[PDB]
Write a protein that binds this DNA or RNA. Sequence first.
RNA 1: GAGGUGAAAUUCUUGGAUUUAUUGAAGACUAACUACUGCGAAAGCAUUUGCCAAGGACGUUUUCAUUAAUCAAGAACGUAGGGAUCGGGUGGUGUUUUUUUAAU
Lengths: 55, 232, 242, 116, 247, 35, 162
Amino acid sequence: LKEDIHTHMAIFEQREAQAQEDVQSSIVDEDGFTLVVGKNTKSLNSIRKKILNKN
Amino acid sequence: QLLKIFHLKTGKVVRSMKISSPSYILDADSTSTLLAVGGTDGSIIVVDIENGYITHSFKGHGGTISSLKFYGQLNSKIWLLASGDTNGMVKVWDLVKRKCLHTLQEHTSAVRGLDIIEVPPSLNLLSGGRDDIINLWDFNMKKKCKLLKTLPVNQQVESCGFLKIIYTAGGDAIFQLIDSESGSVLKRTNKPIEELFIIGVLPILSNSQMFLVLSDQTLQLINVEEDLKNTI
Amino acid sequence: VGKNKRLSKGKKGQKKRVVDPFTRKEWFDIKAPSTFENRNVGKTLVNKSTGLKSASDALKGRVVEVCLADLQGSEDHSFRKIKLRVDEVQGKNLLTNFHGMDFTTDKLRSMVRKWQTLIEANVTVKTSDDYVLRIFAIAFTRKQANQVKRHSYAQSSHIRAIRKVISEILTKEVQGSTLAQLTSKLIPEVINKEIENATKDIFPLQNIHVRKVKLLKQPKFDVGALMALHGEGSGEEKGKKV
Amino acid sequence: SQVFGVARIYASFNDTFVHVTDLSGKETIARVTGGMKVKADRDESSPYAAMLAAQDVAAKCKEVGITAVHVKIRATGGTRTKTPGPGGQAALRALARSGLRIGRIEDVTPVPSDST
Amino acid sequence: NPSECDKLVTKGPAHSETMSTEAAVFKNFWGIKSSLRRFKDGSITHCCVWSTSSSEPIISSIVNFALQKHVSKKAQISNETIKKFHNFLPLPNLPSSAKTSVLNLSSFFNLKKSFDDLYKIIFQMKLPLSVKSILPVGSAFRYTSLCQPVPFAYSDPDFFQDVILEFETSPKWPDEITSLEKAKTAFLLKIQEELSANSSTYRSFFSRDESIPYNLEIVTLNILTPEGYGFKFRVLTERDEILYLRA
Amino acid sequence: TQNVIDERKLRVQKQLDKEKNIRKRDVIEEALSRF
Amino acid sequence: RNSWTKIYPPLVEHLKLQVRMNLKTKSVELRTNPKFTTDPGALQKGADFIKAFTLGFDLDDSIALLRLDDLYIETFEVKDVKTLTGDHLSRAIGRIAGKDGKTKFAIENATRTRIVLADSKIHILGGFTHIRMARESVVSLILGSPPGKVYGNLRTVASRLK
RNA sequence: GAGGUGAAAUUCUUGGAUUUAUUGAAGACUAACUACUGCGAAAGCAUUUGCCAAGGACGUUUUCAUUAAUCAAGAACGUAGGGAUCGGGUGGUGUUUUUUUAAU
């Protein structure tokens, strides 16, 4: 379970960090627009499901 | 600062020692030349008084040290020490082998007033206290046991036991005579109209006259050898 | 004073010389609750165990202000003395319980300086038992790192926010606990770090402390619960021999 | 094995108090003042007066049996000096010298929160 | 009165020289089993000792002797219901536990003493995110285990009591439940590593859990203590119930 | 006030040198990082 | 930190005890060693030594408290007398300090004692009646008197000193 | 013995003064934080929390269109430059922060 937690944390922090920077620099929309992200939010899926929940 | 004055025409300070703790109990032997003094920590030094200096140390103990007593018959080979206590215990030492003979943890307050005698080495002892228990023991030389407790209702200070086998007790300005091997107060002085109580009993003429020094600054005489063959 | 001063009409009343009370007094020793270590804290004089205002009920009201370093053996908190109420006397050992806590005043008088603002809060909160506590909390502004200005002042509308969140979270930390649990979570100083973690979002907040717990109403005795806080015990025979 | 009293050294004006109590606070032991040692009425707040007062308290408390003293210095408090005078340090030096173990020196002088 | 229902001595009147009328009443009432004892405080009281037992309350033996001394020396006292399902409780294999009473909780208190030893050891070590509050939740800690917990009893399913611990409220916990539960396993691995490092007299072994469903990766550790008891440690986080509400 | 302005100049000097030094500069712990 | 090289040898080799400068709670703790340290009041004297130094007197003044043990250290406040609102408080500390410390040094050289003064709390160390003389001169000056009059009063008190 | 002073003295005190501890009541005040900082027309204003209204600055591609100022009588209450700081706003881009609970 030590090598399991090593491998699982090693792939998880990598995909979390790349999703965080991907939502932190997602400036371009195809028609001119700039997506407001908010500070230190980690995921496009997170803001998507948040804006679905705020209906 | 321990000092000794030779009472004779040379009234000079013969010996002077630097003891460890400020002490509040001394006893010399029934013979001469043995003086025991224990401080207010656990240390009971004993001193040969002729060429005055420490002959035994006796770290030994715990707490501040209550009254104590010798066991002295002239030209013996026994020479025990009694060693009462504040937290209730009696730890008997000898003086010929410097060893704790028997450890006894049984009491509940300051063990004032203990006494040692032999009746045919039998050597029965008796230890009173600020608790109301006088608690005599058989006290063999090798291994010891207990006998009766016989419970006087006082706060006994200097329970001078083994009169003619009859015990004494003081501590409410009440000099109770109590039989041994059974319990009955049989002689007991008049309770005064003060609150002050017995500080000390003092034997004169081989346990026949009794001096009584009070908590007040007075000192009385009893004549036990008449008032035991006499009630009150 | 001396012989040359005065008689002053008060020394004519005679003196009632000596009672020598320390031959009559009696030693007990105190047993602290078992949330701490080293529960023996010292000894206490009382009176002689007689009738007519006996010892076991002339007792059982007092408090003892012991130091937390004397309880824990660790000099990391030499301050923060506590007060133990002696409650149930049981066979020469005064079984005590928690009654209060206070900082030694030198610690807070050396903590407070100028060019920073301090925040106070205090709530009346009932525990999961029926004790009620005026529990306090002190807080201080941190000079932020890489700062330049001497001030580090709070805007006094941050002060209401910090005091609201600190009263809310320590009200939660009391109300989700009993008194023994409150002592065992106050000793290793953890609501301070909880305040700092939940309150570092709004302001940087130099060292947080609680500094006072005042009990204002006690439920009942519950002798069995007080014996459960230490360990059981059954006083039994000693030999008659008469 | 040691046992502990509590000093409650009062460094008042025109007087000095020292009386060790067992650490509850009820059973006081050997109340002395600065007045009951010196004979002048001018220096009953003397450092020497507090010195031999603390010496006599140390003797009586070693007679009773307490060996260490948690020491607590109190000034006169109130809307007054709020801070120990010389008699507090004098009694502190005296009973720190006189064979008595000392613990947890503090300051229990009352603070007013702006009374009258 | 269930508080002093099983107090094994009955303190009668105090002792004096003048034997009072209630002392004479107590002497003539009890007689051969009365005594006068000193208690630990120092007072002297007439009383009567009672050899307590687990299969009885002492009030049975007291009413037995205090009727066979007074109403009749042949009036037989018969009870068997108490003796039948007063020992349907399992008799815990302790020192003298048959002789002890049933209101004694000393097995639970010994377990809590071992828990306090483990409590101090788990506090005064060092973590990357230290323990905020460790607190037991187990059945022995609420005094409702079926058997009284004797040391080294493996086979009882109420052996491994559960203690939970909550860490500081740190924001750096991960998002989803499998990664935060895996981080809880990481913290438990750290504390058992340092426990086998510094305190070799204890021991640790992990355990999968399955009672909380649909996350097979919930892991507890179990401490086997040198006093003889075992504990099951569960990490709680502030993110847990809001993760479940997110789900 | 001169001492105040002097202390601010000292703090700005200290912060510029600290920023200059800042600009010029196992398994289970890898899993237990970032806390 | 700048005077730590002169503080500890009168705490180690002259006076027998041992020191630690705790950076935990930013304090100084003093032990006495049971093996060879004499003078059972030396712990208290060294504690009062570093107490005077951290209270504000200079280190030679604190050494003068360490040796010659009968010098005590009184402390009082501006706020106890006349309640001293802040403008008048500035007048008070400026009046006690004089100009270039000259009135404070006059009281220092006159009454054989040495004072230091914080923003609202002052401290005088010396012998006890010299503490009282300096304290009555200071409280007269803080009530507010002509400095020539307090100079003449200190000439009379220096005549009492001789 | 306490008080009190430069010394005293008056007073209080063995029906226990001072001091100690546990409380309880009463009114007034808000120690340190406290600054060349904040507010109000002025005198003045410092514990927390809530209510009731008001006010200032800022922000503004909002509205009205000279409604302004100055004061008897009356009325209510009693020369140019630079640095730093407080309140608001804009921009920058590092650490504090953190993440789908709201806030900013």
